[PDB]
Structure 1
Amino acid sequence: SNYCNQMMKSRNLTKDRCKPVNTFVHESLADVQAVCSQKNVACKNGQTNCYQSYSTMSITDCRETGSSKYPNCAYKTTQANKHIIVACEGNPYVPVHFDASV
């Protein structure tokens, strides 16, 4: 429950501002990269190179509290099991953008 506060920091997500929302995925890298060969769907931005994971994945939702303030960025850590949706690109075809989870 202090996870998001550490994680946002170790991953340089609180460098100049506090990243409001951020999602971390706890599956193997291999499983997450495999999503690129799963259900093809529209990205929020309108491109058509997003994919949704056939399976729910173990994830963690990091959202800043209403009271948080740089440099002491504060986060609510919510764990969840959800289908993720990533944009894939390049060779190897791998995720390059987290898009959403359902």
Structure 2
Amino acid sequence: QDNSRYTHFLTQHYDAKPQGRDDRYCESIMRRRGLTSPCKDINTFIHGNKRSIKAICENKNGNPHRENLRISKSSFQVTTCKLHGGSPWPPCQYRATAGFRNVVVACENGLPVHLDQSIFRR
């Protein structure tokens, strides 16, 4: 029942209904979620329903993937924030890329605890 890695995953990588998913969105949400001291070079947020993200950890919405990971069956609205410049330290300028695809996570105790950022590097 230690769900600290799960709640930290939601803080770093979940935003249920974001509205506009533009550069302005990235610069504000990266500050809100505490990902700017220092500036995280890439960070992806998953949108939609929490339960479908949890379900990646089951055969209901996931397949095993590479050494220790799982890849979702369903596609998710996502937004990738990429650091522009320059400096590791704030102010942190971000380029947003809105996407729609499956996601790769690590699961522990049936909860996502890590997002594999490599599929969003592109």
How far did 1:82 drift? 1.1
Residues 43-72 of structure 1 deviation map (CA, whole Å, 9 limit, x = unaligned): xxxx42x11110111000000013456210
Q: Secondary structure at the match of 1:78?
A: strand
The TM-score with structure 2 as length reference comes to 0.71
Which residues of structure 2 form unaligned runs of 5+?
1-21
Counterpart residue number, 1:96: 113
**What TM-score results when the alignment is normalised by the length of structure 1?**
0.84
Q: How many residues align?
A: 94
1:3 aligns with 2:25: yes
The equivalences for 1:29-44 within 5 A come to 29-37=50-58, 38-42=62-66
Please report the RMSD computed on the Cα atoms of aligned residues, expressed in angstroms.
Answer: 1.6
Equivalent AA in structure 1 for residue 114 of structure 2: H
Q: After the TM superposition, which parts of structure 1 deviate over 4 Å for at least 4 consecutive aligned residues?
A: none
Q: Name the structure with the higher strand share.
A: 1
Hey, what's the Cα distance between the residues in 2 that align with 1:54 and 1:36?
11
Provide, for residues 75-97 of structure 1, a one-character-per-residue CA deviation record: whole Å limited to 9, x for no partner. 0011000110000002xx10000
Q: Determine the C-alpha separation between the residues in 2 that align with 1:31 and 1:62.
A: 22
1: distance between equivalents of 2:74 and 2:40? 27
2:112 alignment partner, SS class: strand
Match of 1:26 in 2: 47
**One-letter code of the match for 2:32?**
S
The residue type paired with residue 112 of structure 2 is: P
Cα displacement string for residues 19-43 of structure 1 (whole angstroms, at most 9, x for unaligned residues): 000000002110101011111112x
Separation in 1 of the partners of 2:56 and 2:83?
28
Q: Which runs of 5+ in 1 are unaligned?
A: none
